[PDB]
Amino acid sequence: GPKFPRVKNWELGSITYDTLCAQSQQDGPCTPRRCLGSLVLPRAEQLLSQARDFINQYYSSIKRSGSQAHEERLQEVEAEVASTGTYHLRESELVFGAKQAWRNAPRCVGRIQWGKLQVFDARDCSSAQEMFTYICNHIKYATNRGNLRSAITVFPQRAPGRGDFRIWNSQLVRYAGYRQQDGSVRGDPANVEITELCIQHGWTPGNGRFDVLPLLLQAPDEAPELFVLPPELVLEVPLEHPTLEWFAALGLRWYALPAVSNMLLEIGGLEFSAAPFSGWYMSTEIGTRNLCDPHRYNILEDVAVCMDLDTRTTSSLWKDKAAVEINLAVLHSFQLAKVTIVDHHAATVSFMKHLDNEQKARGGCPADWAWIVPPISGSLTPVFHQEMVNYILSPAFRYQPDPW
Amino acid sequence: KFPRVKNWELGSITYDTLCAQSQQDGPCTPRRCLGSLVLPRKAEQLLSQARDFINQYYSSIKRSGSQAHEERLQEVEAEVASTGTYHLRESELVFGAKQAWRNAPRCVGRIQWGKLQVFDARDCSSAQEMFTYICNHIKYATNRGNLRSAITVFPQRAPGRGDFRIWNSQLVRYAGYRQQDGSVRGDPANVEITELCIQHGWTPGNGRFDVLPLLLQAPDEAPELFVLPPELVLEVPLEHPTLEWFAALGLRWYALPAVSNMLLEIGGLEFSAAPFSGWYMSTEIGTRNLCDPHRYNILEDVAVCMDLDTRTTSSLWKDKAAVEINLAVLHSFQLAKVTIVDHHAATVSFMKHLDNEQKARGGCPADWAWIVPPISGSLTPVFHQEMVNYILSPAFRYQPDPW
Numbered sequence: 156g157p158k159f160p161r162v163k164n165w166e167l168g169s170i171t172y173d174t175l176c177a178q179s180q181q182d183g184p185c186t187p188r189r190c191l192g193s194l195v196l197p198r199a200e201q202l203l204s205q206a207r208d209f210i211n212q213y214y215s216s217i218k219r220s221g222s223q224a225h226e227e228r229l230q231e232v233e234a235e236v237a238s239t240g241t242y243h244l245r246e247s248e249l250v251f252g253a254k255q256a257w258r259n260a261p262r263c264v265g266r267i268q269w270g271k272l273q274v275f276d277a278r279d280c281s282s283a284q285e286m287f288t289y290i291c292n293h294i295k296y297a298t299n300r301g302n303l304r305s306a307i308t309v310f311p312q313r314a315p316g317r318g319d320f321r322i323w324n325s326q327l328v329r330y331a332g333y334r335q336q337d338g339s340v341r342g343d344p345a346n347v348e349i350t351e352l353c354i355q356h357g358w359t360p361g362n363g364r365f366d367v368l369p370l371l372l373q374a375p376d377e378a379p380e381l382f383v384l385p386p387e388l389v390l391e392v393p394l395e396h397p398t399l400e401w402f403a404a405l406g407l408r409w410y411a412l413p414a415v416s417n418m419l420l421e422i423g424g425l426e427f428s429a430a431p432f433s434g435w436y437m438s439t440e441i442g443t444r445n446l447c448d449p450h451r452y453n454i455l456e457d458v459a460v461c462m463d464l465d466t467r468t469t470s471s472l473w474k475d476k477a478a479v480e481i482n483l484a485v486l487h488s489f490q491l492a493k494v495t496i497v498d499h500h501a502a503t504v505s506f507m508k509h510l511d512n513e514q515k516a517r518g519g520c521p522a523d524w525a526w527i528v529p530p531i532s533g534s535l536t537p538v539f540h541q542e543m544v545n546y547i548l549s550p551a552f553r554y555q556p557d558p559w
Numbered sequence: 560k561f562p563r564v565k566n567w568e569l570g571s572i573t574y575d576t577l578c579a580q581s582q583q584d585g586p587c588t589p590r591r592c593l594g595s596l597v598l599p600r601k602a603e604q605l606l607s608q609a610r611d612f613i614n615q616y617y618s619s620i621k622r623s624g625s626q627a628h629e630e631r632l633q634e635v636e637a638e639v640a641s642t643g644t645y646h647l648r649e650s651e652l653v654f655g656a657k658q659a660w661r662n663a664p665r666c667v668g669r670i671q672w673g674k675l676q677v678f679d680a681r682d683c684s685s686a687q688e689m690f691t692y693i694c695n696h697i698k699y700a701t702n703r704g705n706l707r708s709a710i711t712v713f714p715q716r717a718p719g720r721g722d723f724r725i726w727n728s729q730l731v732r733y734a735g736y737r738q739q740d741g742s743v744r745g746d747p748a749n750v751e752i753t754e755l756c757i758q759h760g761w762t763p764g765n766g767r768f769d770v771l772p773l774l775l776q777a778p779d780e781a782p783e784l785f786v787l788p789p790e791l792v793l794e795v796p797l798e799h800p801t802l803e804w805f806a807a808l809g810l811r812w813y814a815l816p817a818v819s820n821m822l823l824e825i826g827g828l829e830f831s832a833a834p835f836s837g838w839y840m841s842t843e844i845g846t847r848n849l850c851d852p853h854r855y856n857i858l859e860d861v862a863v864c865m866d867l868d869t870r871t872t873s874s875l876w877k878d879k880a881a882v883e884i885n886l887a888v889l890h891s892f893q894l895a896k897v898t899i900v901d902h903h904a905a906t907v908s909f910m911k912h913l914d915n916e917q918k919a920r921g922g923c924p925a926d927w928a929w930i931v932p933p934i935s936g937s938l939t940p941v942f943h944q945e946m947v948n949y950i951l952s953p954a955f956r957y958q959p960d961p962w
């Protein structure tokens with residue numbers, strides 16, 4: 156057959172070949188000898204070639220590949236580098252790049268939305284105060300009283316010998332995690348570090364399971380400054396079950412806006428160290444990972460006890476039954492509160508749609524199976540039965556070392 | 560050049576060192592992970608594969624670098640130099656087979672690997688004899704409902720001639736009847752093999768739960784049809800702890816998962832018919848065989864029994880019914896006293912298996928996507944454990960359909 160990965164969906168029996176992977180300029184961590192695909196992280200002319208490829212992508216997307224504008228923009232980019240070491244994106248270039256990084260993201264299952272992203276340019280930003288302002292506008296725009304809109308706020312790009320713009324928080328909205336003297340954690344155990352950093356940098360802390368963290372915002376060559384979100388800005392949903400009436404008495408709650416804030420956006424060799432982006436939740440993020448992970452909120456035993464289940468034996472499927480209801484509770488509460496959310500069935504169906512669109516448009520779609528398939532009910536969703544090719548395309552969102 | 564491996568639940572790190580002893584590439588390259596594909600795209604050598612396996616075996620029994628070890632290295636050097644192959648001793652076959660399972664990275668049950676009954680069926684010259692061997696293996700492995708892992712190893716591949724082969728994918732599988740209306744009555748994954756059986760003589764039933772015959776092929780001969788005696792194949796009718804109606808459905812499932820189209824490789828020899836069984840992990844029946852949409856696809860039917868709202872994905876009727884079905888599978892096995900392991904218990908012992916291997920070998924190579932169950936993934940400790948995947952020999956491989 157065709158000298159490209161053959162790709163099969165074992166439910167429908169259909170076949171495709173991924174020709175897009177040929178475009179990858181970056182190596183992942185696998186090799187003929189061993190697959191390392193379940194690892195969460197693995198550890199000048201270089202700028203030009205990256206730059207040039209981005210520009211060629213730009214011009215192709217607007218169907219001007221070959222044109223004088225295209226070659227003149229190339230000429231322009233190299234002259235800028237040859238004289239200053241770096242170069243700068245035109246506005247609509249940044250907009251296309253940022254959308255393209257979302258589109259290229261292999262662990263993201265909501266990419267059917269990729270073309271509909273609001274891009275706030277914040278490349279003029281000059282202070283931690285200003286960063287705060289921009290961040291609050293972002294939150295306001297995106298949250299939109301529960302009718303959620305996709306957005307990304309691009310702060311200034313890394314410069315040579317000039318420290319980065321950095322949000323220290325991992326998300327814009329996150330709950331505190333307080334280390335006790337029992338050794339237990341009150342709140343979100345995920346956040347014990349950032350909580351402790353917030354206090355040492357001067358936050359007066361609370362003592363709840365759901366205290367929203369302040370932002371630690373860092374502007375070039377400064378210590379970070381601390382900022383508290385006004386509570387009218389951070390929309391939250393109290394959780395309740397449509398039938399089990401005792402569920403609301405548990406006092407569980409989650410915030411509406413998932414907003415990753417420590418990821419590095421890379422476009423044509425330029426690195427934007429600060430560029431928080433936000434969409435809406437898939438229900439299993441809250442209901443299965445945040446609420447049921449052993450190493451997070453871990454409410455499974457609680458709920459199962461309330462549910463009168465036999466928690467002394469694995470074969471009662473008591474964990475399974477409680478996760479289903481915690482999940483139905485996440486869905487029902489957001490729906491009631493009229494905040495956007497997507498269940499794992501709908502979400503995955505729509506990534507299938509996204510797969511055969513990308514098949515027609517680019518002949519491939521980088522996808523990480525282990526992340527695409529949901530944490531409950533995996534084989535009940537259609538992505539489980541779809542084979543996937545995972546490779547790195549630029550523009551990309553990368554992970555980056557923590558600032559401290 | 561050594562992979563760091565982390566558990567995200569507990570924070571612990573390990574380096575895999577086993578994976579250097581890999582001698583056979585998989586499908587990933589640095590440019591792209593293919594980790595999620597089900598199948599691969601498709602003298603002097605055989606000698607050194609044999610050397611290495613014999614080196615393996617004399618360490619297993621702490622006898623490395625000794626007289627019996629050299630005179631076995633010479634026996635092989637001699638046999639290959641003369642005939643271009645060699646043969647294994649029963650005890651070596653036996654260590655080979657257990658290791659084939661030890662090495663199987665899609666396998667969740669490998670805590671058990673040291674405990675395998677091994678039938679040497681290498682003196683087999685006819686399909687007829689295979690039928691008998693296959694039956695003893697069934698009687699043994701089933702043991703009244705007290706399942707015991709077993710393998711039967713038929714005669715190796717030989718340069719001149721046809722393979723000994725079992726046409727079936729499992730020793731026990733239900734059949735697939737295509738209907739006027741393109742609807743497949745009975746079991747969909749086996750529509751083709753049902754048709755092969757008909758093509759070669761079989762009168763068929765028309766139930767959903769009819770047990771297929773066996774098609775056994777001896778070298779260079781057409782396959783012969785053999786019918787499993789109904790008292791041999793142990794079945795479990797499905798019912799539910801609380802839901803009285805669930806029985807009504809005629810739901811049933813057979814006790815013995817026995818693979819039989821895979822090929823066992825050792826010290827470079829190839830065993831084209833080496834069928835093996837253990838026991839089921841409940842989600843193979845409850846989630847996959849019954850809720851796959853391309854399998855019996857019972858979900859809707861059930862969710863309607865349960866009287867859930869099916870107009871909409873966000874009621875999670877899919878999830879709700881999937882759990883009742885898995886719970887019926889477990890109950891009904893436990894009521895009729897047949898080994899069954901749930902997915903929570905199974906993955907817990909896998910974690911324990913990983914720690915054992917880490918102490919013994921420097922690693923366990925495994926395939927995260929197969930090892931994580933098809934419901935409640937992150938509810939199991941395996942969801943949260945990084946894993947490295949690679950090929951070690953001895954091994955079970957896929958091999959082509961004979962027709």
Ligand code: HEM
Nearest residue numbers: 257260262263264265268305306432433434435436437552
């Ligand atoms: C519109 C609704 C959206 C949904 C439902 C969605 C869904 C998801 C989900 C479920 C994950 C995996 C989450 C995890 O378990 O850690 C994810 C990962 C990711 N999502 Fe999306 N997303 C949406 C919008 C966006 C937007 C606007 C972006 C960026 C512009 C985005 C970018 C990403 C990226 C970059 C990852 C990888 C995260 C990582 O590697 O840790 N999503 N998304």
Ligand code: HEM
Nearest residue numbers: 660663665666667668671708709835836837838839840955
């Ligand atoms: C003793 C109880 C055992 C249990 C509970 C068990 C469980 C499993 C499960 C759940 C899978 C994934 C199956 C699938 O989704 O297709 C699997 C795969 C596998 N098992 Fe085990 N197994 C057991 C014993 C054995 C034995 C005795 C052998 C051989 C002696 C074995 C060899 C394999 C192999 C080679 C695979 C991968 C084959 C493939 O690609 O389908 N297992 N097992």
Ligand SMILES: Cc1cc(N)nc(C[C@H]2CNC[C@H]2NCCNCCc2cccc(F)c2)c1
Nearest residue numbers: 195196265413414415432433434435436437440
């Ligand atoms: C933009 C957007 C939309 C959406 N629905 N969901 C998302 C992922 C967010 C929300 N809920 C989880 C978080 N995803 C980011 C978490 N990063 C995963 C990798 C990781 C994990 C832990 C430690 C690490 F070092 C690295 C983003």
Ligand SMILES: Cc1cc(N)nc(C[C@H]2CNC[C@H]2NCCNCCc2cccc(F)c2)c1
Nearest residue numbers: 597598816817818835836837838839840843957
């Ligand atoms: C020994 C043992 C015990 C156990 N519990 N489970 C097993 C796997 C068997 C049983 N339950 C599923 C089946 N798995 C073997 C076949 N592989 C499944 C998918 C596949 C793979 C390759 C080609 C295909 F066309 C399809 C073995």
Ligand SMILES: C[C@H](O)[C@H](O)[C@H]1CNc2nc(N)[nH]c(=O)c2N1
Nearest residue numbers: 193194195525526942943944945
């Ligand atoms: C070890 C394993 O890779 C890790 O638990 C991954 C698996 N898949 C995931 N998938 C998603 N969407 N999010 C995750 O955090 C993880 N965790």
Ligand SMILES: C[C@H](O)[C@H](O)[C@H]1CNc2nc(N)[nH]c(=O)c2N1
Nearest residue numbers: 539540541542595596597928929
């Ligand atoms: C396409 C995907 O790799 C395929 O559906 C795999 C995923 N994981 C699996 N895991 C197990 N145990 N069994 C399977 O058949 C599969 N199928």
Ligand SMILES: [Zn+2]
Nearest residue numbers: 185190587592
């Ligand atoms: Zn890989």
